[PDB]
Design a protein around this ligand. Structure first.
Ligand SMILES: Nc1nc2c(ncn2[C@@H]2O[C@H](COP(=O)(O)CP(=O)(O)OP(=O)(O)O)[C@@H](O)[C@H]2O)c(=O)[nH]1
Ligand SMILES: Nc1nc2c(ncn2[C@@H]2O[C@H](COP(=O)(O)CP(=O)(O)OP(=O)(O)O)[C@@H](O)[C@H]2O)c(=O)[nH]1
Ligand SMILES: Nc1nc2c(ncn2[C@@H]2O[C@H](COP(=O)(O)OP(=O)(O)OP(=O)(O)O)[C@@H](O)[C@H]2O)c(=O)[nH]1
Ligand SMILES: [Mg+2]
Ligand SMILES: [Mg+2]
Ligand SMILES: [Mg+2]
Lengths: 430, 46, 427, 427
């Protein structure tokens, strides 16, 4: 029982899933070929004798990264029908990923998801990995999420997305796709975790003193975040956090389901010896505006609800002490209508380290996921870029020619505007 | 100069008309072609 | 799987395509006899994009070699790697255009082009999932410009949903090979405005200037120019042919660089380019690749970007590289030079990174830039055309071949409209 | 066991038959002396379809060598594999038909048909289970056209339930060798319409076009044309001579390609046909066989299939091949070219697959197609006949030995009626 299915859409989703599954295989002792020389039943299904297949699915409209997986060192882990491949890429087009190219591959991936969901008896929910910038990771993710909403319904849907940075972005037509995918993620998602590549870069440069980090380090960090998310369900702890409890504690209003994830301590090997990494100090470092993996300022935001996921040699009393110290700090403020806003989860098992990784082995680790109003500013400048590009109707034909109209561009715009209005009116004092 | 641009519009219209007539004549019978299958997608319970 | 059909029109187009096939067989490890002698499986995991599996564990290009003189065909076949091409793809006439766009587009090229359409049809039907076509041609002659333009029109009519690529060399005012270059260029650019999905404006001035000041090459022949164009052509599709941290096929560049359908004329560029004597005095790092890409001298069209505004910029990187510093370099480029980038498009630069570098280099970059500075390349052509058009100069050849003066008038009007739209998007 | 009696009439028929026996003895491993020297045991269980058992492990063909000029049989015997034939099967007169259907049918054909029928009676009664006859002849001369028509008629009253197969070279407007071709062709068609179960309309024009554009053969003699015809003749009986996944004898092709008894004129073909230099660059799979065998240039008749509709087609495949690929290729041909196939006959393709390929090739296909393009091939002969018949041109020859104007009138009427019914079923 107590299973959850991972969905990886787009190049970003597939690479993050590769990192996540390498981390999971390291965690549970499963070799890359599937043999383990219990608790692994959450993410792996035992087939026959001595064979574990991950409860995953890899979807792309282009065959580059999927065939890289099919020829990589984890080629024996996944069966071929688990990795679904298109022919022509969505090419950074929400229209192409949603209407023209996504329509002939959605049925097969939904069939695979169905055959993967009836196999397990305690399906907690889905983990969709994607990116807002990509045409596939926006359009096909929106299509798959609405199909999952109409099919499964009350099953939890948790998604991990790579939100574009204010300044560090690699696509010109990016804001269009980012607005469009959120227009449906507002209603087809239960909890959308937000990650900026620029913030990962800043953390890598400062904390891990990596001068030239690439996407593999980013995916390793995101994999550590997801592992800390699912550790309370894949192991035992003093305080256990389930996905339903996570949603209940973190989401105050149905449209407000965009928390910001932070992870600590994320330090190099040479810097770990000089630091006596206590629970109180990593808890403090979680609230540091420099350690957020979303490029935003919590100081000008207001916290609404935060979930503290601890793993390692952690006892509840020092957690209570750290939370009490956090409450006494005036720089971190909470909304009035939430007198208690800390969901606490303690797990005994410590976070493992991937060989060749940049992170150092730590006795304790914290993954705080705070639902705050600091992402209103993120939505604000994404919307400003969208308006500023849409005033001249640039790149609009590249969407109109693929079964799409300007009217829904405007409706996505006004839906985003209603979203910032919602955040503003829930952030006010009473 | 207005007469010149009027003749420009007329010439473009005539060229478009003859091109459309040729396209209509061609579309009546497609040219013989041969290729692979492109198999139809399987249907699933839904 | 996203395979590309290659076509060469005219003498320049044929030579550039032959050099491109040589360098891309070197990249994929295909010997001059056609068999595979590579070392990595990545050289064959995307071999179908450009090559057709022939019987005997060997490969033939998906290329159709087109001209109106058999001499260029013989020259291409006789040279190195010239045996790899399939003999029936060699389509040629006997008369030649004679620098007449009319003879290349209305009478003799029109008579020949049915065979070319048949060959490209069987090539497009033999392959699995075609994504588009690419054509290499000139604009000064009649064979390349006129007949390749006709071929583009026919292909767009037959394949309206596929992407068109044209690595087209445009005439320039100083190195002007022939007398009727602006006539041919204007007539070709007419249909290249609408029948081509994106066009790469190249010209011999910028190539010669690179070979002078960048490569420090004393007497560069056409071979080095063709090698530069071939390297850019390979770097455009290296994301299709090889994996990478961030993939970008030609359609993705098309949607990220063409805000409005008529603005798809780009200035290509390649980095790094260093002389032999300065190879050891230069550092192997990404910021200097960015500086070499974004400076005016590395452009392969005789347009100074400082006189215009960049609309969209592509940078297809190759090799084991870090993403953070690449994104930081692009951010610094867009910040220090905000005046040279269009203001109503945030994030003017699209970045793609491939992991497999070109042979002999551990790091390379391809610059593809859509800027309003292209408009002056059409200003010079238009003013040369207008100078010869007021006096009816050289028009009797085209008129006797079957054209009319109003065709020239409307082609000029089309180019003037394109120039005006570039100017009013420059602001 | 399902034996076939072979008859060759006229010089052209004897040449094509000699080449056919060459290629058949190559297939079955029979030496120039007639004794078995093959390697596979599959070459002997179906040796009786074309050969008879002689004393001392010797194989003699079931061939009748018919002509009026003894020089033709002198040449056939003197050539290679020519001594394999039975000496008394050679039947000959002394005069020669003189390019006259009239003398080949009435005045010196008749005295020889008695002996020919005696020989074929002996051969047919010798064989165990006869299935039909094969006749090779041309329609231009008097021996071939006239006496072969007479022989076909005589066989028809003597063996009406056995299948009548003929391989007839028809005259062409470009390749015209004799002046009275329209007369002989029309008079011969007047009897092939109702006396033959299937007629393979060969012509020299299409064979020369093959040897030019397909095979790239510099100087095609009659040997190569006869080689192509022999390849088609071997293809139509491979299923009789060898096992296979799908087996189709002559009667099965006849029942699958003759919706109405008078439409039994088939347009033959073969695949693959490759140039010596170009065969090295060609992938060799079922789809490329399919695209070659359905190409209008590959066809062995001077009539474009695109000008008409396919009533039925046959694909007698040979070699170890997948049945899914073959049937799917036929399906794709039928679907994407629905305008070129008759709508009132679903599944216009008859497919057979053998496993023993021709020597030197691992797979081959014989295209047979019952199209409506035969109407124009017959209208050419009809209009030439009408032009030569209004003015009574050359009629004094045919009238000199028994023929009359009404026979010519009825032959023209029959050909016009057949053209009209092909037009009717074309719609
Ligand atoms: N970059 C290159 N430019 C070339 C090359 N060959 C020619 N050219 C230039 O191209 C221009 C003329 O192009 P071509 O000679 O190919 C003309 P084409 O054969 O297409 O037309 P016709 O001459 O009317 O048959 C002129 O400026 C030449 O100097 C080459 O290999 N590379
Ligand atoms: N495809 C071939 N056509 C041939 C061959 N030999 C002759 N022919 C053609 O046949 C046509 C006329 O047929 P023939 O010359 O054999 C006349 P035949 O001997 O049947 O009658 P007479 O000579 O009038 O007695 C003419 O166009 C020749 O070029 C051959 O080996 N192959
Ligand atoms: N953090 C992180 N982000 C990535 C990674 N790979 C791609 N991205 C992000 O994904 C965005 C583009 O989407 P992609 O995943 O690359 O492409 P896609 O989702 O398949 O959609 P298409 O553009 O149509 O191919 C870029 O802006 C990147 O920021 C990765 O490995 N790690
Ligand atoms: Mg992608
Ligand atoms: Mg030329
Ligand atoms: Mg004769």
């Amino acid at each position: 029982m107590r299973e959850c299915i991972s969905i990886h859409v787009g190049q970003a989703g597939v690479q993050i899933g590769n990192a996540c599954w390498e981390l999971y295989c390291l965690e549970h002792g499963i070799q890359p070929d599937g043999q383990m020389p219990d608790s692994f039943n959450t993410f792996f299904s035992e087939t026959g004798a001595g064979k574990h297949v991950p409860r995953a699915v890899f979807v792309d409209l282009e065959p580059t990264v999927i065939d890289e997986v099919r020829t990589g060192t984890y080629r024996q882990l996944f069966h071929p029908e688990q990795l679904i491949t298109g022919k022509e890429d969505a090419a950074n087009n929400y229209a192409r990923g949603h209407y023209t190219i996504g329509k002939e591959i959605i049925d097969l991936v939904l069939d695979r998801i169905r055959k993967l969901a009836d196999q397990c008896t305690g399906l907690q929910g889905f983990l969709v990995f994607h990116s807002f910038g990509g045409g596939t990771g926006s359009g096909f993710t929106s299509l798959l999420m609405e199909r999952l909403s109409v099919d499964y319904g009350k099953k939890s849907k948790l998604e991990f997305s790579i939100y574009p940075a204010p300044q560090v972005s690699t696509a010109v037509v990016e804001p269009y796709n980012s607005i469009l995918t959120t227009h449906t993620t507002l209603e087809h998602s239960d909890c959308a975790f937000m990650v900026d590549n620029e913030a990962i870069y800043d953390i890598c440069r400062r904390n891990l003193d990596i001068e030239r980090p690439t996407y593999t380090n980013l995916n390793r960090l995101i994999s550590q975040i997801v592992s800390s998310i699912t550790a309370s369900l894949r192991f035992d702890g003093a305080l256990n956090v389930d996905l339903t409890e996570f949603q209940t504690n973190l989401v105050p209003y149905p449209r407000i389901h965009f928390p910001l994830a932070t992870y600590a301590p994320v330090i190099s090997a040479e810097k770990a010896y000089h630091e006596q990494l206590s629970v109180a100090e990593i808890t403090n470092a979680c609230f540091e505006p420099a350690n957020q993996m979303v490029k935003c300022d919590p100081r000008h935001g207001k916290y609404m609800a935060c979930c503290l996921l601890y793993r390692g040699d952690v006892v509840p009393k020092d957690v209570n002490a750290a939370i009490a110290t956090i409450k006494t700090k005036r720089s971190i403020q909470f909304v009035d209508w939430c007198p208690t806003g800390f969901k606490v989860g303690i797990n005994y098992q410590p976070p493992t380290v991937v060989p060749g990784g940049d992170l150092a082995k730590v006795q304790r680790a914290v993954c705080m996921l705070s639902n705050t109003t600091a992402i209103a500013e993120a939505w604000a400048r994404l919307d400003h870029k969208f308006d500023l590009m849409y005033a001249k109707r640039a790149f609009v034909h590249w969407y109109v020619g693929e079964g799409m109209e300007e009217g829904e561009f405007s409706e996505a715009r006004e839906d985003m505007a209603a979203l910032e209005k919602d955040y503003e009116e829930v952030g006010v004092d009473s | 100069g207005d007469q010149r641009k009027q003749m420009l519009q007329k010439y473009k219209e005539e060229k478009q008309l003859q091109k459309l007539k040729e396209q209509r004549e061609k579309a009546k019978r497609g040219i013989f072609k041969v290729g692979r299958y492109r198999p139809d997608m399987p249907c699933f319970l839904l | 799987m996203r395979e590309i059909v290659h076509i060469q029109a005219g003498q320049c187009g044929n030579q550039i395509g032959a050099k491109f096939w040589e360098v891309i067989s070197d990249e994929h490890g295909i010997d001059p006899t056609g068999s595979y002698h590579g070392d990595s499986d990545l050289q064959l995991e995307r071999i179908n994009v450009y090559y057709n599996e022939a019987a005997g564990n060997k490969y033939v290009p998906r290329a159709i070699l087109v001209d109106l003189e058999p001499g260029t065909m013989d020259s291409v076949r006789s040279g190195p790697f010239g045996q790899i091409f399939r003999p029936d793809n060699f389509v040629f006439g006997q008369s030649g255009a004679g620098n007449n766009w009319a003879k290349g587009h209305y009478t003799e090229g029109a008579e020949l082009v049915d065979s070319v359409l048949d060959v490209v049809r069987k090539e497009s039907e033999s392959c699995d999932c075609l994504q588009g076509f690419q054509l290499t041609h000139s604009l000064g002659g009649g064979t390349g410009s006129g007949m390749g333009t006709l071929l583009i029109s026919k292909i767009r009519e037959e394949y309206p949903d596929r992407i068109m690529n044209t690595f087209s060399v445009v005439p320039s005012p100083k190195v002007s090979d022939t007398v009727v270059e602006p006539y041919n260029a204007t007539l070709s650019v007419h249909q290249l405005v609408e029948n081509t999905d994106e066009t790469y404006c190249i010209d011999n001035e910028a190539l010669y200037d690179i070979c002078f000041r960048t490569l420090k090459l004393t007497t560069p022949t056409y071979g080095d120019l063709n090698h530069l164009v071939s390297a850019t052509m390979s770097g455009v599709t290296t994301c299709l042919r090889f994996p990478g941290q961030l993939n970008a096929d030609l359609r993705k560049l098309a949607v990220n660089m063409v805000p409005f359908p008529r603005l798809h004329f780009f200035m290509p560029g390649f980095a790094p380019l260093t002389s032999r004597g300065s190879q050891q005095y230069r550092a192997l790092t990404v910021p200097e690749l960015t500086q070499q890409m974004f400076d005016a001298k590395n452009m392969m069209a005789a347009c100074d970007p400082r006189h215009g505004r960049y609309l969209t910029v592509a940078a297809v990187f190759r090799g084991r590289m870090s993403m953070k510093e690449v994104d930081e370099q692009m951010l610094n480029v867009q910040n220090k030079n905000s005046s040279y980038f269009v203001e109503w498009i945030p994030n003017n630069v699209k970045t793609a990174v491939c992991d497999i570098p070109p042979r002999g280099l551990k790091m390379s970059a391809t610059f593809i830039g859509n800027s309003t500075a292209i408009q002056e390349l059409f200003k010079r052509i238009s003013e040369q055309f207008t100078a010869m058009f007021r006096r009816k100069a050289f028009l009797h050849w085209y008129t006797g071949e079957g054209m009319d003066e109003m065709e020239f008038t409307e082609a000029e009007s089309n180019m003037n409209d394109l120039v005006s739209e570039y100017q009013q998007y420059q602001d």
